Design a protein around this motif. Sequence first.
Motif, short mmCIF file in Angstrom:
data_model
loop_
_atom_site.label_atom_id
_atom_site.label_comp_id
_atom_site.label_asym_id
_atom_site.label_seq_id
_atom_site.Cartn_x
_atom_site.Cartn_y
_atom_site.Cartn_z
N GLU A 12 0.82 -1.20 0.00
CA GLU A 12 0.00 0.00 0.00
C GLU A 12 0.85 1.25 0.00
O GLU A 12 0.53 2.22 -0.72
CB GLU A 12 -0.92 -0.04 1.24
N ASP A 13 1.93 1.29 0.74
CA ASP A 13 2.85 2.41 0.71
C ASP A 13 3.35 2.65 -0.71
O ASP A 13 3.50 3.80 -1.08
CB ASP A 13 4.04 2.17 1.59
N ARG A 36 -7.46 -4.20 6.76
CA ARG A 36 -8.63 -3.58 6.21
C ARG A 36 -9.75 -4.56 5.91
O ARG A 36 -10.43 -4.51 4.89
CB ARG A 36 -8.32 -2.75 4.99
CA LIG Z 1 -1.29 2.79 4.91
#
Ligand SMILES: [Ca+2]
Length: 263
Positions: A12-13, A36
């Motif tokens: 995600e980064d 998530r």
């Molecule tokens: Ca994040």
Amino acid sequence: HPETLVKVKDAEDQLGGRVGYIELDLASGKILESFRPEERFPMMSTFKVLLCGAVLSRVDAGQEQLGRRIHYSQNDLVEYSPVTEKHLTDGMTVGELCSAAITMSDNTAANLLLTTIGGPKELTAFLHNMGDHVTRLDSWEPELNEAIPNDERDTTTPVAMATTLRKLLTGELLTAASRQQLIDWMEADKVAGPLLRSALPAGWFIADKSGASERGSRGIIAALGPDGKPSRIVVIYMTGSQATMDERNRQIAEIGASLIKHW
Ligand SMILES: [Ca+2]
């Protein structure tokens, strides 16, 4: 090899947007780890497994036959229909259409199958009726994938999808023959090579279905495990970024390497 949650967060980064992940124990249904889990993501073509679950459920109810042949016409063909476009003269059986939808991600096959059940609202009804009050299908193909601009339309969550997939593949909501048929189709996937398959050791079993949008999104659902037998469900979704397809694919493959190396 980074820990899988570390790797998910790193993905995600690097990508931007969001990455969602869950791993369930197939036998027990317990959540083994997640990121998530309750957030919404576009399903893209991952919905095609759910669609064929609804079709199989009708087969089990005596309302459909996998050998029923569907003829269709040129005007039914939509983007990305590599199998259906080759059968204008002969048509395809319901079972062939599920094979094409799942294994090749054929969009016209999915539309034809949606017609058999009465449309996207009826797929959502099927899901509701099996206890999934989260997952929703709103669109037909190709509007559904090649880009769902991020509404709640055509979305699931990692946990809802994983849970629903486990209920279709195990237990008794489908008959033994239909559960087997669904997993067979997923094992035969031909279009998910760059993803979890890229990280899978010799001798493992994987049954999967991928999804993509042109921009922004990617995903995969899978049942996998060593020694020829699936033992876990993995769901990964990506959305909201500007990352290339090669970058989305690489990050999924790298998440897969982590979860295999830490299995
Ligand atoms: Ca994040």
